[PDB]
Design a binder for this molecule. Structure first.
Ligand SMILES: Cn1cc(-c2[nH]cc(C(=O)N[C@@H](CC(N)=O)c3ccc(F)c(Cl)c3)c2-c2ccc(Cl)cc2F)cn1
Length: 303
């Protein structure tokens, strides 16, 4: 049972503009991006704003803090640069930018690289220099997914871009996964053994199709930190809500559905705390069908 614990909004704004979230390295504090390009730090229990920083001149779509608390990735809608890396030690400052990448992620084991996505193209950057180390795109193997998002595997040896598996060291495509949908390009399971591409679950070693999970169709997915639960929310077909009003949970060990939660409001983002005690969900109290952006963050205790 996802038990509500707290609710809060962007303080003292006529219309609340939270768009995305991630827990900080400090217990009790959530980082939220906003539709005017700010980063906010909030106490999730009191609902009070602690700090605000200026990141972009357009809506933040997504953000990701490094596990060590030293760095932050942000992505925006229209800005130049589209994505950026921020230092959060001593002073909040821009370390590097990624001008044309509309989505960025850290590498997973050692967080020394950033992978950015531009359409069906992946770009790998060094955190220290900001230099682009690699561009990954093979015209012969492209799936041309419409909502592609390039990603590292748990040990940072492989990248999945546009449904193509790349060996990062050789910068060579080693396998193209067959196309079953127009949009979703896929993620690695944290177990290191499986690739989840829309409804298809592939074995990474043999490239065999292991399972079909129809309820994952058109979903973005995130796992809890401990890798026991997978959350999926279906994309929707100024910033409109990326998701509909529902999310689904699955057992990460066997892909069996656990719960389907309809929050009856469009969802902008979802995350868990580092101890996987809580779920924070950004939900629009209004609707952009009426051009009303007025989001809240809802905090739930996971059952
Ligand atoms: C205007 N705009 C908003 C987005 C966006 N916002 C949140 C996104 C996003 O992907 N959020 C992740 C979690 C995370 N923070 O990584 C998520 C995963 C499972 C879910 F059930 C839910 Cl509700 C969200 C995303 C998102 C959606 C699609 C893609 Cl391909 C990439 C994204 F980052 C993107 N554009």
């Amino acid at each position: 049972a996802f038990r509500p614990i707290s609710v809060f909004r962007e303080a003292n704004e006529d219309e609340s503009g939270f768009t995305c979230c991630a827990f900080s390295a400090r217990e009790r504090f959530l980082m939220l991006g906003t539709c005017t390009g700010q980063l906010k730090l909030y106490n999730v229990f009191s609902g009070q704003e602690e700090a605000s920083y200026n990141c972009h001149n357009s809506a933040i779509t997504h953000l990701e803090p490094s596990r060590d608390g030293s760095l932050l990735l942000t992505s925006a809608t229209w800005s130049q640069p589209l994505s950026a890396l921020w230092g959060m030690k001593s002073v909040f400052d821009m370390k590097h930018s990624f001008t044309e990448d509309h989505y960025v992620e850290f590498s997973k084991h050692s967080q020394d690289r950033v992978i950015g996505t531009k359409g069906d193209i992946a770009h790998i950057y060094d955190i220290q220099t900001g230099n682009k180390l690699l561009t990954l795109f093979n015209p012969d193997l492209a799936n041309n997914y419409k909502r592609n998002c390039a990603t590292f595997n748990p040990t940072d040896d492989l990248v999945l871009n546009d449904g193509v598996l790349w060996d990062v060291r050789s910068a060579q495509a080693i396998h193209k996964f067959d196309k079953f949908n127009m949009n979703i390009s896929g993620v690695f399971h944290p177990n290191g053994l499986e690739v989840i591409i829309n409804t298809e679950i592939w074995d990474l070693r043999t490239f065999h199709l292991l399972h079909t999970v129809p309820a994952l169709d058109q979903c973005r997915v995130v796992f809890n930190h401990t890798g026991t639960v997978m959350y999926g929310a279906m994309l929707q077909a100024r910033m409109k809500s990326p998701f509909g009003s529902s999310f689904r949970t699955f057992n990460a060990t066997d892909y069996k559905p656990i719960a389907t939660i309809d929050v009856k409001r469009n969802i902008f983002d979802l995350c868990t705390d580092t101890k996987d005690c809580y779920l924070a969900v950004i939900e629009n109290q209004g609707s952009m069908d009426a051009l009303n952006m007025d989001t809240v963050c809802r905090l739930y205790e996971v059952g």
